[model samples]
Target: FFFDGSTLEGYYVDDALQGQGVYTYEDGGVLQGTYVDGELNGPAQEYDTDGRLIFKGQYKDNIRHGVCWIYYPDGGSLVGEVNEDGEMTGEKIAYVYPDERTALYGKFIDGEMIEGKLATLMSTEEGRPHFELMPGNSVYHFDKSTSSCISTNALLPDPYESERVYVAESLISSAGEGLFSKVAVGPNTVMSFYNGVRITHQEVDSRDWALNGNTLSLDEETVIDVPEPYNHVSKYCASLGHKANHSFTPNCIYDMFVHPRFGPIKCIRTLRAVEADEELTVAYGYDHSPPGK
Candidate 1:
């Protein structure tokens, strides 16, 4: 760990690849390299802001053991694989799939592996060093509009409706059929912050959900996150349609009994996201993700 572009001072351990390396520095020259006795037997490079390599490969103790090839400030690449101790363990095998989603880091131990924070050796804006994958950090966020890989059916952008489907069932305890679907466009679809109502242009029989003024209950799911403007296009409605040729409730808003979706922390029966660490408490906001198998 070393810095000056921000703070922190110095340390070193490169020892000459003898058993691999470990280093640190500050005054903004900011450089760090590692893997001595704890593990990572060889080759672990990095540098930029003015230095270069962008990122080289292999290590075992600092935790990137098998294949690490990262390089992309303009060169392009994102190779993956690692297990000896360097931690990214595998599954984003791209020699060039770069449309986006590029955050990386590692950690794991006692369970048999660990490596996080330290190796940040340095590089900010080229590729492989903007690090922030903490709360267990599972990522994918980056669409630029549509089609690169978000599965569930893919196809997005353009009046939108090229493809997207997920049918599972258990719309939460039961309503009379299988469900789980979602679809939305903008401005809470069109206004209804519960009376601010906006159900989408008009036809669902031309709009009229007075099940008591239409919010079903749950106070607009906490007023759209309390105070942040969250609803972007809520999903999970496996049944309703007026012209996919015709369809009602379409179902799976995950079904009441304390609904909001369903899970340890739920809500996404139809579009809007961003609640990690949660705050804003609800003034209205939500889209949807995580459902079906």
Candidate 2:
């Protein structure tokens, strides 16, 4: 049967979809599942226009309601139990792509992972395999080449340590707060980690820029949002990274680094030696023009 540029080929009872069926969208996406009284009510699989499997799960009353596996275009995947409302709940495991062994073991609450540890693999500048094991708030990095745990001293400063930077009023006219160095920081030093709540890309798009502008996109699927209440540096310690205002000629740059405690984080690294009291700045990498201009 064809309707609204979509085609359905399956069993029918009393003109309603019943049993196994295949629904094809005009754009080439497809949904194959078992139906009961016109509603999807059993195991199902959904594919994109390009034929990539996007969702595989059980359905009830047309909504996802049981164990499900969401596959991302980047090859990462999330397998967990979803409620009748189609929200992830209870325990879930996310496998990061390009390395299946690397994964995040956690529990989902309100469709968010409130507690988890991401065991990940990293490669140094020289291309040596570096492994990081994060158990709760503690992090341990092991160097397979050297056969020992690498010293954290050689890496970025711990975000829990507030001695490197402080928060103050921004020098950018009208910009509120900015990050400042507490000591003379040397060139190429990994200064601070951008710490915040991890949110999905969909959540990022739904939020208003005026209220959620302090977001750092980590990848296609994840974003780090630093809300205003969490911007107090002295209180939070790891909150200074978001306080750095944007600059055309930035003194610091943003780079991806795996935090033993925070998993993957965007870190601010010094581009050159900076004296005490100098504002730490980074290129925001987008049109800085005010809205409605």
Candidate 3:
């Protein structure tokens, strides 16, 4: 059967594409899989124009599902499972092809790695050196230099601080204070939550200009208001969240999710790898001005 810029050949039942079939694309890629009522429903393999295997995975209703393996041009590969929506879920393992002993293991949710561990076999190290990533965005390194694993932020007075952020003077000259990471962190780690007093929309509007600037709207009726004077001594976690500055090209994003214990909360999550001591910034919407503006 002919599709737009492609052709499908294999079994057919009552004019419906069924059983084993192969789809040849105009770009020279070929997809071979089992079909149920014209939709891919079982294991499948995809080949590139050069006949190189690109992907081998399971499909459900034409969407990636179950176990999947993706090959990359750099010789690296990713083995993971995807939900029906094609979002990476559960455990994932990534291997640096040329060096099979060096690999990364992580747990993913909705395509984001909430936690991960990288194991590397180094010549200088007597034992395997590994890095452990925590949910709060802290990294622990275990190598020959240390007998046990030590946090990258081990210098801190409290090395086990759940929230790996600190409040400091803003990098933006006129933006007051800002939030910063204590240690380097990888992408998608939840850095901190917007912790503050919950107030109604009416109460939020009642506040004067000074108090309005720290407010974050959670919904049509609710707003989180950081108390006056930007108190940094009373609560450590509360102090950091409200200090994040605004940036046009932000490295982090504000997302809302239901916390198991706290119920609903807004948090700051990294979009890419962030270096230690880097100021955390987020886009504050069109109503707000960028840093230095």
Candidate 4:
């Protein structure tokens, strides 16, 4: 690799040259990696501004490919992969042992592990699925893959039955954007519902509606009073609770998936591991809040 100035302006690389190079971000992040033909290739390492190694892995054609080890800014590490299409692929493997050996480990698909085990210590039911819950509420399966706490076991029933959700006329009328956050502790029956809206107008529920082909279109002027529950169709996972404690770096072991409902309503899903006892959480993002408080 080569640079034109101190600021790394007009930098270049050589395919024949195989060596490590350093690139620094404006925010103080430093990346040191092997480069070929002016692109990140082979093994590259990334460090946060705090000088902590956050990622170390393979690259192909300047894109993440093959096995990559990603570390949280905290003290955990995750194994991730990127396919040739530059899309995230491969099963996630998280280490949960003191020495990071094979005694225990979790094999996960997108970070969801079914069970974990100690193969050498107890050599029975290798094929049978069993899971052990951690204090953090993370479940693991037994594995023969040494002392690493990686769970490699059979799958089991999911906590969700399809998407547990609902939609209703929101009491708030701020016209603000919808609330997007983690699914937390809430009664599966009721009281789990919070205020959320796709349309911010108060008069929307009373409007006349019609269906055109596959589309449900509403008349803007026709008015009729619609009562609670009848007026709203809850989005997926609404009963799971639409709120979560805000955190820039949530220690809570869950992520949220927000998607469309009724072509306008929003829904959520648990994107990662978390305690059933713990309220599901997600990063609320910067300078944002739920609608109407």
* Candidate number achieving the greatest TM-score relative to the actual structure: 2
Off by over 4 Å in 4: 1-18, 25-28, 80-82, 85-88, 95-293
Considering only N, C-alpha and C atoms within 3 Å, which residue pairs clash in candidate 2? none
Give the TM-score of each candidate: 0.21, 0.44, 0.43, 0.32
Order of candidate numbers by TM-score, starting with the best:
2, 3, 4, 1
- lDDT tens digits by residue: candidate 3, 1-293: 12322344567788888877888879887887879998989878777876677677878998988767666543344556666687666765333222333434566565334443554323314212233332354322211112121112323222221337887777654677778898798887667656555677777677564567767777886776565533443433422556778787888987774331222456777889999999888886742444443
**Model 4: what TM-score?**
0.32
What global local distance difference test value does model 4 have?
0.36
lDDT of 2 by residue, 195-266 (tens): 666777777677676756777777777777665545444344434577778877899998776543455667
How should the candidates be ordered by lDDT, best one leading? 2, 3, 4, 1
Residues 180-249, model 4: lDDT tens digits? 3223432211112221222312334344432110111122422112123322223223223333333344
Of the candidates numbered 3 and 4, which has the greater TM-score value?
A: 3
When 2 and 3 are scored with lDDT, the better candidate is: 2
Error of 4 at 234 (Å): 32
